[PDB]
Amino acid sequence: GLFDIVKKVLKLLK
Prior knowledge:
86% helix, cell cycle, protein, monomeric
């Protein structure tokens, strides 16, 4: 699910 991939990105964005 994309909701676990966005969680990898939000951890890098902030």
